[PDB]
């Protein structure tokens, strides 16, 4: 924990367009969520003209962003500029150096992704439940980005279920009506396929006689 810079120095370091809050979003970079009340208190302090002021914000504490302090899952539905402010890694690490981070609490680090016309911090990636067709209850939950391909989902299901190289496998998604949609195209993304957290993704394996299990299902 480094000596606190002067107020104007902190403002510039944390806000500037090179290394601070105004830095453009670039795919792959890390950004961190800061609970908005803390950041506004820091802003009032550094704009307040009194380095000794009681408006000093104290340790960063993102407690209100988490569902609980057991698994530290982010609350759903958080809104940038209302619940939290985004800072790039350099600015987050400076703020932690200066003010500290609440003891025992993990940072909230998220990555920029590239969408067709925009870059965005992916605050909420997609957790998919991967299962074999023969046992829909034995799942492995795996996090994927919205920009990952369906092919990566399938390769991941094959790895997690120890599918052998010569076995043939293909994916299905269980939809909200309770039926199955075939994921024919491995080149499209998780976003293109409209997959959602908690969704069941079924890896079907071709039988050794060359027929597929799904031939037996009502179409």
């Amino acid at each position: 924990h480094e000596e606190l810079p002067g107020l104007d120095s902190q403002w510039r370091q944390i806000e500037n367009g090179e290394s601070g809050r105004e830095r453009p979003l670039r795919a792959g970079e890390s950004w961190f969520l800061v609970e908005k009340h803390w950041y506004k208190q820091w802003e009032a302090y550094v704009q307040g003209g009194d380095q000794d002021s009681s408006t000093f914000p104290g340790c960063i504490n993102n407690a209100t962003l988490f569902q609980d302090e057991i698994n530290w899952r982010l609350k759903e539905g958080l809104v940038e500029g209302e619940d939290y402010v985004l800072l790039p890694a350099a600015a987050w690490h400076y703020l932690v150096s200066w003010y500290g981070l609440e003891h025992g609490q993990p940072p909230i680090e998220r990555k920029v992704i590239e969408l067709p016309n925009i870059q965005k911090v992916e605050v909420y990636p997609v957790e998919l439940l991967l299962v074999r067709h023969n046992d829909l209850g034995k799942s492995h939950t795996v996090q994927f980005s919205h920009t990952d391909s369906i092919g990566l989902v399938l390769r991941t299901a094959r790895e997690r279920f120890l599918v052998e190289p010569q076995e043939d496998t293909r994916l299905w998604a269980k939809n909200s009506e309770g039926s199955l949609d075939r994921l024919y195209d491995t080149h499209i993304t998780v976003l293109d396929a409209a997959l959602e957290t908690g969704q069941l993704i079924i890896m079907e394996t071709r039988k050794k006689d060359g027929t597929w299990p799904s031939a037996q299902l009502e179409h």
Binding site: N134, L136, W172, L180, R182, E204, E218
Partner: peptide
């Protein structure tokens, strides 16, 4: 057996 009871939504 659950998979075999599920319906396949024919694509458009």
């Amino acid at each position: 057996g659950e998979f075999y009871k599920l319906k396949i939504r024919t694509p458009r």
